[PDB]
């Protein structure tokens, strides 16, 4: 299972 | 910007036995960027039912792909891979050697 969850560099 | 030259391997999935079903593999690896033209060839001519694996990459970020198709070796038919890439001035061709 991959990551959620947000991010943004 | 970074540019790496593909390594090219042409081999059979199983040991090539004349008249039996098999798969012809062309595994290019260690290249960058990902844009790459790979053909499998039967007697100088281009095959159409060729599939490839999903684009993935290695420790060093260089990409690898496997191109393959169902084939049945024969005593006379020649097979090869033709790979073009920005690091390659002209399209490179590697014949399939069963032996090896």
């Amino acid at each position: 299972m991959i990551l959620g969850g947000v991010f943004x560099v | 910007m970074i540019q790496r030259t593909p390594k090219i391997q042409v081999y059979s999935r199983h040991p090539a036995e004349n008249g039996k079903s098999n798969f012809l593999n062309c595994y290019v690896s260690g290249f960058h960027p990902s844009d790459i033209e790979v053909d499998l060839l039967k007697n100088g001519e281009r095959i159409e039912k060729v599939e490839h694996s999903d684009l993935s990459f290695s420790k060093d970020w260089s990409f690898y792909l496997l191109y393959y198709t169902e084939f049945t070796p024969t005593e006379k038919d020649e097979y090869a891979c033709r790979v073009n890439h920005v690091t390659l001035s002209q399209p490179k061709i590697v014949k399939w050697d069963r032996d090896m």
Binding site: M1, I2, X8 | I2, N25, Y27, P33, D54, L55, M100
Partner: protein, 275 residues
């Protein structure tokens, strides 16, 4: 033994020829289990291992949603990184991301990771403590600073210690037939004659899993590491791998040379001789 689950994301910018090409593949150990392709038709996270296909529509929907958010995050990064590097808008550029988790033989967390590249070279990386960052250069210090204020390590560490290893584990049992197998190398040697006084001697390892393997040639017990030709381990196409190593023998010295195979599937290191 020890196991890992890893996700690879690749985002290429094709300016004025559509949106960025996004590709994600997922692996448990050396086995690929899922894929997303921004070009593909389905537009869903799809299965690529038989042992993952019936996981429910709720697994497939949640996974499709997330990788669609990955898509839209990496589209934005491509534009932001053009900025960071004063690059023209016509240039094709690449972004790569790799994250996942390992476990030991206890199936408990061993280590987690989250690396990132741009145009084929390291950009920024989650340090082994999973709490700090490691920028490769000037433009990457900004991004480092950004994630420090957003507290992105905390969020990664969260997924790496929990959901990650936790699902690595669910899969290991779901496809325990594929994922806990070990195929030992099927070995043999060939002999071809380059010319009259020379002969190619080649040692083969076929149909092994996992990919990790060692093939070494020797002369009178002396390693020919520098005189050998090794090739990269390669996918056979059926979940197994291949690899060979060749030396050249002065026709007659065949008995001097021997090939050594090492694999986690062999009880004892095989020694091949030509005799």
């Amino acid at each position: 033994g020890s196991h890992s689950m890893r996700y690879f994301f690749t985002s290429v910018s094709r300016p004025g020829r559509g949106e960025p090409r996004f590709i994600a593949v997922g692996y448990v150990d050396d086995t690929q289990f899922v894929r997303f392709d921004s070009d593909a038709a389905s537009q869903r996270m799809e299965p690529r291992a038989p042992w993952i296909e019936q996981e429910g529509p709720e697994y497939w929907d949640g996974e499709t949603r997330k990788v669609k958010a990955h898509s839209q995050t990496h589209r934005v990064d491509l534009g932001t990184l053009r900025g960071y590097y004063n690059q023209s808008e016509a240039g094709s550029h690449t972004v790569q991301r790799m994250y996942g988790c390992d476990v030991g033989s206890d199936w408990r967390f061993l280590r987690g990771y989250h690396q990132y590249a741009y145009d084929g070279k390291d950009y920024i990386a989650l340090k082994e403590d999973l709490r700090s960052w490691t920028a490769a250069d000037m433009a990457a210090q900004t991004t480092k600073h950004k994630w420090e204020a957003a507290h992105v390590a905390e969020q990664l560490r969260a997924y790496l210690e929990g959901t990650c290893v936790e699902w690595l584990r669910r899969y290991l049992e779901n496809g325990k037939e594929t994922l806990q197998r070990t195929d030992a190398p099927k070995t043999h040697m060939t002999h071809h004659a380059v010319s009259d006084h020379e002969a190619t001697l080649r040692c083969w390892a076929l149909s092994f899993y996992p990919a990790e393997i060692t093939l070494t040639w020797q002369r009178d017990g002396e390693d020919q590491t520098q005189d050998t030709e090794l090739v990269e381990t390669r996918p056979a196409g059926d979940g197994t791998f291949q690899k060979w190593a060749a030396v050249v023998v002065p026709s007659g010295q065949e008995q001097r040379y021997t090939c050594h195979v090492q694999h986690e599937g062999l009880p004892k290191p095989l020694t091949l001789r030509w005799e």
